[PDB]
Amino acid sequence: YANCPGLLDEVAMGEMEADVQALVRRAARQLAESGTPSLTAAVLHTIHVLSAYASIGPLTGVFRETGALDLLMHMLCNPEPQIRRSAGKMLQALAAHDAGSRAHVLLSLSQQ
Amino acid sequence: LMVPLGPRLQAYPEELIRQRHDGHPEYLIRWSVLKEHILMWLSAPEVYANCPGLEVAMGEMEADVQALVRRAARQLAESGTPSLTAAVLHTIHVLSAYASIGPLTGVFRETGALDLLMHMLCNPEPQIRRSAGKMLQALAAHDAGSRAHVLLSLSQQHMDFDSRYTLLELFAETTSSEEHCMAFEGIHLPQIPGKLLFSLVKRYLCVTSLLDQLNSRGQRELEFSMAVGNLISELVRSMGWARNLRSIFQPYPLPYLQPTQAEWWELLFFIKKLDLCEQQPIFQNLWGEISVSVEMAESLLQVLSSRFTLNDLLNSQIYTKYRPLLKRLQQETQPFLLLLRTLDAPNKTLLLSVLRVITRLLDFPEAMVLPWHEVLEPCLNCLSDSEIVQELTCFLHRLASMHKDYAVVLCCLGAKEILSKVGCELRDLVTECEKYAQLYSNLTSSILAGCIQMVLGQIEDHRRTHQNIPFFDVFLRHLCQFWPLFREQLCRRTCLFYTIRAQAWSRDIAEDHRRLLQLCPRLNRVLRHEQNFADRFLPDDEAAQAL
């Protein structure tokens, strides 16, 4: 109020969070099925969709709330190199929103 | 697979982008060149020859996009809140993310999203407008044709020249596709005034839309013919350059060396140029593949010439082989060229008469038909006699006080620095708006490059057709008489095309050895077509030998 006062519909946000939860479920289903390149390409498309979902600013609380972190970590341990790079880009896009997600992600990534 | 392009140039493909006389699915692919990157259209057998390697979720995402658009309808209908714009912005983020997927383009177009973009056109929020532009850019990345359609629906809406400039600049920024992306020339392409730019932009949009939609077939023939003709005519006019106009392969008899429709094409184009009242009698007298006699063509040419831009046709080749002063200058724009040349020459009597005449003639607004602008190059480049210099400055000032479009034309001419070097109010005239020269340069260069892309791509596509767009001779000839750089582009294009075809033929022949007996006539036909191309469209025997 003293220095800069001027600087002072989430249903769709939560809906997209739940939809991303279903999408991550389907993506992990494809990851368990990642023995055929068709499902691998579909999983890459799903990961692109997941990143686009991650492009939001304020919904990081839901993004972690859906427990996407562990699924993403498993995806980083997948032998899909291009998909691994894409997931890394998605995590980096996530990083600007919050630091704690990144810290926990890499920290769990270390204990392998 | 590595493609040997040149002594230092090599190439290699990147990915499939799209699909489509074959009547079969096809594929357009980009190719990175290591020594920029090129784009090409191939066919599935040629794909297997050269590029061997390269579901219900689509339905789910389509339902998501449809429902999202339905929600965004209300998200935009309630644009009266600080949260309204932000929710619309989030919706736009989701959309532009979705439309970056190939299949989503048809869904968005089928979703009536043109209505959404239209509601975005009237955006007082510059953030919302630029976000819609970003969405359109993503749509163009998805598919150029859908982007053309959307921008046309935007164009489907005498508006303010400033508003016109705003809309056109937005469209130029948004539609800077990879095709619109092109190499800077580095050589002086002359100034392009504003209204010419707007008209040519409209024509280019028409041409691109028709070309994308190309694939009875006579409809496609007429569409491509009319679009290419109008574009070539407008580009020649705005450039104004129309006022200036043995063995093919060896360095026994050659079977290919031993062996008009385009005239009818010009005739039909001009008959289409005639209005309904004008064109109807000629069409009735005629009553796309009309067979005629030379006398019939002469009669049609006379009938066309007998009624009424006309001087532009008078400067053509088909005419060879087969307040009153303002209207007069309209009938003969070459008289305007003569006036400009007369001013384009010492003594003070001639130049004084020229200056006084221009001043006393501009007083009548009837100059709207005349361009009155082509001279502006030397009026600032050359002029420095005291009275003469004052007269030139006052003439520029009068032009500035007349038209803000002509003011922008002088702004591109950079009259600010010169009038600062000077008898100075013209500098203040130039100090009206200095934030449009980048727009002028960008739009002009991009449009010229786009036209060159169109012609080169058409020739490449015809290479498989082996069978005439109006005035195409004029454009390629003017570009033929720059030519080093564009010639480099042409030879690179031909090299890639023919390498792909040759590898395809070799792969086919490897299957069965009986193929060569049928192979020989194929080479005959190909070499014949190349010889025809070289004979019709290439002056320098050295150029033909290089090709």
Coordinates of C-alpha atoms in Angstrom, one line a residue, chain A residues 9 52, chain B residues 87 97:
Chain A
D9 CA -12.5 -18.9 -12.9
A52 CA 1.4 -27.4 -22.5
Chain B
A87 CA -9.5 -16.2 -18.0
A97 CA -1.2 -24.9 -27.5

